[model samples]
Target: ANQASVVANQLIPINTALTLVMMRSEVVTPVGIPAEDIPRLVSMQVSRAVPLGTTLMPDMVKGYAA
Candidate 1:
């Protein structure tokens, strides 16, 4: 039997001073979100300013839905 490892996508940091752009159908995994949850999740914003190349976890942001 062979095992497979799940690797998360690398979320490259952008300009912290600017707002983050939410792509349609984007997920919130460790790197971002999950595929199915993308639709479920609403657009969110970073609660505080994070440096570049930082991991995007739940603590770093807040979701604002309609």
Candidate 2:
């Protein structure tokens, strides 16, 4: 078990954020939605408290059907 440990940008509270700017995550997280598009997650809010890494994904952030 030798997985590269990633780092979270910061300790995000409930309703955190994401995007190319590193929202958060570790443990080599999957290149989430951000990698696909401009990341509408920026400055957005999260559903639950974001751990350090390995927990940041499109699902982490709250839903915004805008």
Candidate 3:
């Protein structure tokens, strides 16, 4: 099976030195909210969101290891 991956960056409302930053995301599966509106759904179902500049980066890695 072939899968597609994408990375997106958006401004985090929370104040930080860098207002805009990168967020690494891996979509295992995308689901539309309101099944009836699925046809109009134009966004990815984010499985996880990691805050930037956190120790978690070293503690936990993002994306598939292999």
Candidate 4:
């Protein structure tokens, strides 16, 4: 339905960034971290800490799409 947001970021250290983000409503988050690309995130995850409510980008996830 909607894109994903930072449900968790502090504990995001090398944890695959999987549970870190989640799908959210477009009303507040109209962009970033297209849910379509969620699979990629689940694959490699992120390399850094993303702030709360911050959107997940291509660079956020380490080994995802460039």
Candidate 5:
């Protein structure tokens, strides 16, 4: 075999009351993140916390497109 490694998944807590943001919406929301949208978030957090090549899709940030 070439090589093998084991990875561990840690528990990340999201406490809205203690959080700074007025609103806390990660995986759950009224509109909700589409099954397709989740991959983008994971890709972001895992890639670089802010990737360079991705397009800036500012929907709600703009004036609400949906």
Candidate 6:
């Protein structure tokens, strides 16, 4: 096995449409979603004002309404 090891609580950046995937040890924290619903946090959009390669946080992303 040669999978890339990611930090458990590392800050990730979103460019375009990002489909949140569950990691073996890392947690992807987003807005509105609860700790239990962390895995359901799929599909994320970036704000136009936000520059590319910027670290994404819960507040940085808009509502997750489809």
lDDT of 5 at 9: 23
Top candidate (lDDT) = 4
Model 3 residue 38 distance off true place after TM-score fit, in angstroms: 16
| Model 4 residue 39 distance off true place after TM-score fit, in angstroms | 3.0
**lDDT of the candidates, in the order given:** 0.37, 0.52, 0.28, 0.53, 0.24, 0.37
Q: Stretches of candidate 3 above 4 Å error?
A: 1-5, 11-41, 52-66
Query: What TM-score goes with each of the models?
Result: 0.34, 0.48, 0.18, 0.52, 0.22, 0.31
lDDT, candidate 3, equals: 0.28
TM-score of 2: 0.48
**lDDT per residue (tens digit) for residues 1-66 in model 1:** 222211223332332322233423222334443333434333444566544444344445465232
Candidate 6: Cα lDDT at 18: 42
lDDT of 3 by residue, 1-66 (tens): 223232234532232221113343343344212222222222322224434332112112222122
Clashing residue pairs in candidate 2 (N, C-alpha, C atoms within 3 angstroms): 15-46, 16-46, 25-53, 25-54, 26-53, 26-54
| 4 versus 5: better TM-score goes to | 4
- Candidate 2: tens digits of C-alpha lDDT, residues 32-62: 4432233555777767776655435556667
| Candidate 1 Cα RMSD (Å) | 7.7
Q: Give the poorly placed runs of model 5, Cα more than 4 Å off.
A: 1-12, 15-31, 43-66
**Model 6 residue 16 distance off true place after TM-score fit, in angstroms:** 1.6
Q: Locate the minimum summed-lDDT window of 10 residues in model 3.
A: 55-64
Rank the models by lDDT, top first: 4, 2, 6, 1, 3, 5
In model 6, state the lDDT of residue 21: 36
Task: Tell me the deviation in Å of residue 42 in model 1.
Answer: 8.0
Q: Write the per-residue lDDT of candidate 5 for residues 12-66, one digit (tens) a residue.
A: 1232111121222333223332333332343122211212222223231222122
